[PDB]
Amino acid sequence: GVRIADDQNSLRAGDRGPTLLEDFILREKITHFDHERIPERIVHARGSAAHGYFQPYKSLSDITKADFLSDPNKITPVFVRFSTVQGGAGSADTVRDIRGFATKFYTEEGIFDLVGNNTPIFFIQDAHKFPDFVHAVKPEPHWAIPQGQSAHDTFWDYVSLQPETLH
Amino acid sequence: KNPHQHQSPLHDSSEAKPGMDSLAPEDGSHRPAAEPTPPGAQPTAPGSLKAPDTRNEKLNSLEDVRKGSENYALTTNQGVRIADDQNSLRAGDRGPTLLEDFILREKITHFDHERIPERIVHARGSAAHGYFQPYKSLSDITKADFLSDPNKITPVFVRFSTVQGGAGSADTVRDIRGFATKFYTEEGIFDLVGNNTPIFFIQDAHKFPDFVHAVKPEPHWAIPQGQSAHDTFWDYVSLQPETLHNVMWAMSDRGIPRSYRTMEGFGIHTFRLINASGKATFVRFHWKPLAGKASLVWDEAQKLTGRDPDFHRRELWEAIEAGDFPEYELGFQLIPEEDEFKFDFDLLDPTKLIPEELVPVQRVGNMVLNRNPDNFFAENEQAAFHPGHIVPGLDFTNDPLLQGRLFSYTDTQISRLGGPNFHEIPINRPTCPYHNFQRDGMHRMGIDTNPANYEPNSINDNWPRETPPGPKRGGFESYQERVEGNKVRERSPSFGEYYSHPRLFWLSQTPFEQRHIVDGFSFELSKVVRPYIRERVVDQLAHIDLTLAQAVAKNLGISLTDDQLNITPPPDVNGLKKDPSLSLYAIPDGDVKGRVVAILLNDEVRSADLLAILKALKAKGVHAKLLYSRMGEVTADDGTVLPIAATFAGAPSLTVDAVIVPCGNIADIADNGDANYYLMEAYKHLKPIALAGDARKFKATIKVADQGEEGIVEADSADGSFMDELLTLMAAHRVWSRIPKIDSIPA
Amino acid sequence: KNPHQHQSPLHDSSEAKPGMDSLAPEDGSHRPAAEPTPPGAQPTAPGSLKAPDTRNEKLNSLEDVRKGSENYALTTNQGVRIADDQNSLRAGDRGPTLLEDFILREKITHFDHERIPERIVHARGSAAHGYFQPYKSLSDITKADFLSDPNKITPVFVRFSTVQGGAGSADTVRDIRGFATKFYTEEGIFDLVGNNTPIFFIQDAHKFPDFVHAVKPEPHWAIPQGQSAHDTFWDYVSLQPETLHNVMWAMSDRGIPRSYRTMEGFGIHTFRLINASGKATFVRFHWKPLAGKASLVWDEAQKLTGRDPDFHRRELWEAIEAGDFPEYELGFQLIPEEDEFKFDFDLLDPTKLIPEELVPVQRVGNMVLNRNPDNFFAENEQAAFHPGHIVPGLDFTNDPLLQGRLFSYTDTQISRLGGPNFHEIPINRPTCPYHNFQRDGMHRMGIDTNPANYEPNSINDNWPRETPPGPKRGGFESYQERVEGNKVRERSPSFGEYYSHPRLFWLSQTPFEQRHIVDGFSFELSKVVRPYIRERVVDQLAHIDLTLAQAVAKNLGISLTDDQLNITPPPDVNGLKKDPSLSLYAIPDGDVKGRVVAILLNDEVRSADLLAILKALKAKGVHAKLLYSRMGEVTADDGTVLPIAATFAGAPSLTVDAVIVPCGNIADIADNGDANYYLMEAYKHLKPIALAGDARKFKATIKVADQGEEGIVEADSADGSFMDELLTLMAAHRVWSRIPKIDSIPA
Amino acid sequence: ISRLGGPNFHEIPINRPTCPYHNFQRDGMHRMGIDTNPANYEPNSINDNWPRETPPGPKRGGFESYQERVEGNKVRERSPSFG
Ligand code: HDD
Ligand code: HDD
Ligand code: HDD
Ligand SMILES: [Mg+2]
Numbered sequence A: 001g002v003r004i005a006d007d008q009n010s011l012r013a014g015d016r017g018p019t020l021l022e023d024f025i026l027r028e029k030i031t032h033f034d035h036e037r038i039p040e041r042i043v044h045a046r047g048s049a050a051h052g053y054f055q056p057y058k059s060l061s062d063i064t065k066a067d068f069l070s071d072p073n074k075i076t077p078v079f080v081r082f083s084t085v086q087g088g089a090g091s092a093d094t095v096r097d098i099r100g101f102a103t104k105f106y107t108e109e110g111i112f113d114l115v116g117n118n119t120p121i122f123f124i125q126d127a128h129k130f131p132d133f134v135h136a137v138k139p140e141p142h143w144a145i146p147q148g149q150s151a152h153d154t155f156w157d158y159v160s161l162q163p164e165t166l167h
Numbered sequence B, C: 001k002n003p004h005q006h007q008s009p010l011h012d013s014s015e016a017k018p019g020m021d022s023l024a025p026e027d028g029s030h031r032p033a034a035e036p037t038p039p040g041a042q043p044t045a046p047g048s049l050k051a052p053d054t055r056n057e058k059l060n061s062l063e064d065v066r067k068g069s070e071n072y073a074l075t076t077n078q079g080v081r082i083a084d085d086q087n088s089l090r091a092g093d094r095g096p097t098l099l100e101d102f103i104l105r106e107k108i109t110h111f112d113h114e115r116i117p118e119r120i121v122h123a124r125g126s127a128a129h130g131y132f133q134p135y136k137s138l139s140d141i142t143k144a145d146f147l148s149d150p151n152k153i154t155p156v157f158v159r160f161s162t163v164q165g166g167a168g169s170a171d172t173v174r175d176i177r178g179f180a181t182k183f184y185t186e187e188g189i190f191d192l193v194g195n196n197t198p199i200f201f202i203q204d205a206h207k208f209p210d211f212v213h214a215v216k217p218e219p220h221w222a223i224p225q226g227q228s229a230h231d232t233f234w235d236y237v238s239l240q241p242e243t244l245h246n247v248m249w250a251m252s253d254r255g256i257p258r259s260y261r262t263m264e265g266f267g268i269h270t271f272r273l274i275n276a277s278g279k280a281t282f283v284r285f286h287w288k289p290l291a292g293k294a295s296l297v298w299d300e301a302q303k304l305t306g307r308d309p310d311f312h313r314r315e316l317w318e319a320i321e322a323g324d325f326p327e328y329e330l331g332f333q334l335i336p337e338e339d340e341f342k343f344d345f346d347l348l349d350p351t352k353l354i355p356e357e358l359v360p361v362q363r364v365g366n367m368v369l370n371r372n373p374d375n376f377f378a379e380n381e382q383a384a385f386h387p388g389h390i391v392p393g394l395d396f397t398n399d400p401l402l403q404g405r406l407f408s409y410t411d412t413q414i415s416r417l418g419g420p421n422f423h424e425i426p427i428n429r430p431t432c433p434y435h436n437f438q439r440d441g442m443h444r445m446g447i448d449t450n451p452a453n454y455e456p457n458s459i460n461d462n463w464p465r466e467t468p469p470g471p472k473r474g475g476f477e478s479y480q481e482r483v484e485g486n487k488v489r490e491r492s493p494s495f496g497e498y499y500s501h502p503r504l505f506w507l508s509q510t511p512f513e514q515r516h517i518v519d520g521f522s523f524e525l526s527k528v529v530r531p532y533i534r535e536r537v538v539d540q541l542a543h544i545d546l547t548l549a550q551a552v553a554k555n556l557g558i559s560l561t562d563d564q565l566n567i568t569p570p571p572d573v574n575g576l577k578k579d580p581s582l583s584l585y586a587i588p589d590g591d592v593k594g595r596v597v598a599i600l601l602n603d604e605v606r607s608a609d610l611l612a613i614l615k616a617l618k619a620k621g622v623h624a625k626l627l628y629s630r631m632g633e634v635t636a637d638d639g640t641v642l643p644i645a646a647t648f649a650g651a652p653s654l655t656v657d658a659v660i661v662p663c664g665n666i667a668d669i670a671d672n673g674d675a676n677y678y679l680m681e682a683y684k685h686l687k688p689i690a691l692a693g694d695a696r697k698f699k700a701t702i703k704v705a706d707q708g709e710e711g712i713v714e715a716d717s718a719d720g721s722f723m724d725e726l727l728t729l730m731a732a733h734r735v736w737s738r739i740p741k742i743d744s745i746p747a
Numbered sequence D: 001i002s003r004l005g006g007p008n009f010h011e012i013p014i015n016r017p018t019c020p021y022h023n024f025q026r027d028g029m030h031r032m033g034i035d036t037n038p039a040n041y042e043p044n045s046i047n048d049n050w051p052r053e054t055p056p057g058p059k060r061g062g063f064e065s066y067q068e069r070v071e072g073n074k075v076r077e078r079s080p081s082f083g
């Protein structure tokens, strides 16, 4: 909360002198900058999000006691993030990939996250294989190529050996 | 007892099922009263529940993040109501736990990650909220807003600490104490991050990891905790005589304060005050305790780390719950710029003090600590204090210890508090506006709407904007000190004097304080395994004072050489041999309010004695603990039912300031080893003892003759005179005249 | 003394300059001997320096990361030689510190980030290296490779711990102790993560954060450290009778062991052994101490947390330096699958023990701890133990406490050790091969060359590859237990019995052990502020045993109701009323080797007495500390110069097993308060005392009549019979017969 | 400190010097080096003050900064020569 008088210059001993360790304003600003980045998502790192709302057409109380589906008078705020899968946060949007479609419903009885994709099936059957599949589609570990693409040897190696992936 | 036969509501497998529902006792005895109450009268509680009426702008600003509990459903962190918080989900009631139990995994995950790194130093500490107010405007010497107006109230948060030990170490160790104050001013947070002695051990921050490593537990085996009494510490001291001044303070009773309420605070470094006209005045900061200065004695302090390792934390909390608020006067030693070189010592040397005889401490304002936190972890553990947090009207100096500190306290928070957004943790938030172009970082709370995250910008008309310096509400600008020199890693020759300040300190102590310093060195050096290290430290003491050095050497079985006996004493400090302000006790100060007396009961107490005792203590704000050989109640001679606070063993004499034994059925306790020992321990530790009627028979256990002695109050009954005498002794803290008598007491 | 007048090499500003160069004493007395030496003889040292010839495959594998020091230049972490490690770079020698000082900033940065989160529980602990060997092949019952061959040596790393307190808390608290063993087997790391009692407090892991929060310091004020003696713990216990069994163990002297060498260890849970034919046998794991079972008494333990909070850490380290290696026999209680429902208690219930009278502990192998670490932080603090770390030949059961543990110990390391590569921290590394397709993560050390990071793969011919299960060197496959049940959050009704095991434990104790349990409950409950909680706990005790409940109630001033007096006792455990294996002392065990005796010196000791004493102690492997009123040396009647280990106050009786006073000039110490108190404290704590010649005059201070008493050894001189008598007393640990006499002793 | 998880980033294999490195720094997240020095501070006598400072010199000497003359007031100010 300390007002800054000069946000253009470091504190130095003379205007052509060394920068002083006692410049706390510089160090705070640079420290914050130096630690801006957090780890990206292991998968679906590239994504775009918006706020909105959901409303049911009629009460579904006959089949579910979920409060957000209990009456068309329930307006539930949502936050939705769409994504690719393979590429980093700085990768491109219009790649060939599966897309994520994740919806956070802020209900009166808790958060419900519907975490889906844009196709009705997945590549693999058992979660134990997820790191194998993801490693195969991701950039290859020696050289970290290619970004945002399944068009490389390791992906098609895995697919060829795991026919469950074909769908 | 009709009302004291509570049975548990759970004797069967209902204990393993949901729906245990209401479990509080019907009599409401689970709930502490939300009013001031003396120590031990009620269970302690979060501050906002104990003292909701006690408010300040910072406390009020925390309401957004306070979480209640009463009448709420138990939920996951996502807001899902939990039906059964007693069991994991399994395939059959004797089956394996299922991975789909998200309730279990959330609860265990949070548990698994509760701990954060402790502070590298000062990990052990205790904190409270309060406020500060200046006595008058200091605008003639500083433009600091919080010092500009006597009606301006500044909330504070204060953390007191030890230095060496971990967060789980003991309170009453021999150590330096930290005294850190966060001022939530209208022009920014100002952190005054001080200690309870006026100097530090080292001169240049470059040595801090060396010094700290030397005092900390040794790296092979991580021993010893909370103690400087080991080889590496004294090795470093013996090889770095610059340390001797603060070592003298640590070996004195300054190293073992009675309470955080009864110690001084110091900023140590020379800083600058800058006024609206741009004039700089050198300043050193002081905190003077309203309760006066008071310390334990070593045997007591050490044993108390065992009997109650939380003694100072507890006493602070309970004083505040009692309405007995810690108070400290802020004081400034002020030195004009033109006087920089008028002293024998360098003003920039943090191993040198400025004697009050040369530069008086001018009273500036008062700070009162009046509310405990709600959650220790959230408010105390996560609090971040840093001396680089200054405000317009203050500035630094080239003190080379201070200079390096400015780097460390920002840096360390990145691991300790998990990233660069530590100012967003509620306790650390300013109460004044804060806006800038900084973005992102782990656990970013603030959601910025500025179209621009840079300046200069046109797209937001260059907001937020720089503010020119000025008399009030202006931007921060450094004082334009002239710097002339070559780039060097070099200590100033003016710093190269190590013995005169230790000698000044030594000569300012009373004879009993000197004895305690001798005994501090002797005890610690006896735990040093390598004898040559002991000998090298004794050699350093001979450069300070020969009487000191000879007394320590005698206790270590060391003989000084003829050359050591002829070492020329160091010079005076600007003509001073001594300064009585450096003694804890030379000049009487403070008062008995908030002290505590043990009252040793028997099974038929003389109620007239007890009434007189309690009335007199209450009138002076002194607390009492009624002790016996068991808990529950005893009944006095007149039928008064007396509730017992603790047993003799449960609340030893270590925990009180004085002991009183009323009359009654003294035969009940006369042969009780614990009751006799209670008195022997208090006697050894120089505490006032008062004995009424047949309780005078206890004089035999403390080897006091029929004629009595100073420090033992006695009479036929407690109706004197008796209580005035006892309270007068308490005002003097301890019975120093008794010291020659204690060597023969087996306690 | 000619050779004991070492002076410091630094009295001037050379201390603030580079080139201090060699500072060790010319006599080489800084360096400990690299050979076994008794406690206190030499300074302690890193294990590889103290005992370089003590080796095992794990210790040898750490050589790649061990860093030396002698004859090396001081550098930055980038390998740049430092010229001046005393000063920061400044513009002039009284100027501001410069940002370009990269040496300062690197050194301070590293310092600023030294601390990592402590363990959520068991934060306080002490560790050593050693090895394990089985007595015979167990291939008939398990295919576990480390149990397959008596000549197969498995390196281990063992960490002992308390539970509640922080890393900086005290050793000799009343608490459960952890006993965690990392076995570096040829087929993977197996961690046996146990405690020193055979059961836990709770049944289902879902409650672990509740229980732990209740026992830990209370969240408002973070008090008390290292203690269960507070309201929230006893609140939880009173409402969760499942806790009562382990509470009984904690309130017994089991809660205050003499040493980590003198306690038992238990896996607690029922696990499975799986043989090559696929047969499962239920197993519970035991460690039996070669040194026998032995505990402190409460007053002693509590005071020792003050006098030496590092007592157990110290004793472990020093035993190993002496060549007095901690040894433990591994034992198995084995139950066939078809006997799962044979007992009154559910085998899957971790609040129930399996009595050795019903299922004997079969000896399986021996573990010896024979080397200390080099660096406490690197090896002890960063070690990660986890009970999910099993190997082929072992498997789990559905114990619902164990089941949840399996989640926690992997999860918690992500914050504590900074990410998923914690197995790459040297102490945690397997010594057998480890290869897989896992990649990256913070601080990744291993550089993978596999073209593939997935399987199945063709590009590396599918390596590394799965291994089928088999008799030896096969893949891990779970035992195909049949699971039949609905998905429920529900405790098994078979677990809903809470009082019979507490009663079995109670009835198995000696009368003095029962007294100590009563006094444990009484002391702890006296510190509970809310009286109804005390009453509710007493009510629970009345469901266990009325004698226990009445004794505790009496100490609390509580009156049991007529209904409480008529509570039906719980049933026997499969016909057992008691089992003497549950007592510390009922069946004599162990050995005086490694115990320690205080010898109280005077200024002209009778050398004949001292020589006889020391020779007899040495013959039985018992250590001695020579104590006096000062440090240095005294000279015996025959001119023998005797070095003093510590003062009476510096090494109190708390720290030793027995006290011996030889003759000589007894007048020198007869009126010394500290020497008299030494004997009183030892007397109170039931320790053997031996008095030779005029030292028998000390009987007066302990109120022992001329005719003597059992537990006080006395004679004209320290003859053969004298030392035999003393050593016989030491073999029985304490003088329990003295208990009625101690209430009158003021100590 | 955030990117590489703490102060021991020089111990990540690619970052390690190939020349000797020894000092009194200890601990920190993912500490790989196991120090055997009895001392973790200097000056020390217990390890005869090793590892030791090295004076500057023509080869294999300690780092010393060039003693540039600094003369000026403490200012947040761009040099006019840069304008
Ligand atoms: C066993 C691991 C695993 C498996 C089998 C899957 N995922 Fe996943 N998924 C993750 C592990 C994961 C994750 C590592 O936990 C991520 C990345 C970081 C995060 O927050 O969650 C994630 C992120 C993630 C996101 C991005 C959410 C966001 O915008 O933040 C979407 C839309 C999905 N996943 C969707 C799926 C679908 C539709 C799957 C199969 C039907 C699926 N995932 C299988
Ligand atoms: C170069 C480093 C360095 C030096 C020379 C000092 N300190 Fe410091 N101090 C730290 C580095 C540090 C730190 C590592 O940055 C700590 C621990 C974690 C934290 O938040 O600050 C710290 C904590 C700390 C605390 C605890 C604040 C709290 O309660 O959270 C106090 C009171 C002080 N120090 C006081 C001093 C005084 C009076 C010093 C000399 C006059 C001093 N320190 C020198
Ligand atoms: C569901 C959580 C949970 C439950 C029910 C338990 N523990 Fe645990 N224990 C942990 C969660 C945990 C932990 C949080 O994962 C710790 C602390 C940090 C660590 O590495 O593991 C741990 C540490 C820990 C240690 C210290 C290991 C070391 O020295 O580093 C020991 C000896 C035990 N535990 C023993 C037990 C025993 C004998 C239990 C019951 C029979 C038990 N724990 C139940
Ligand atoms: Mg009612």
Ligand SMILES: [Mg+2]
Residues within 6 Å of the ligand: D018, D019
């Ligand atoms: Mg080379």
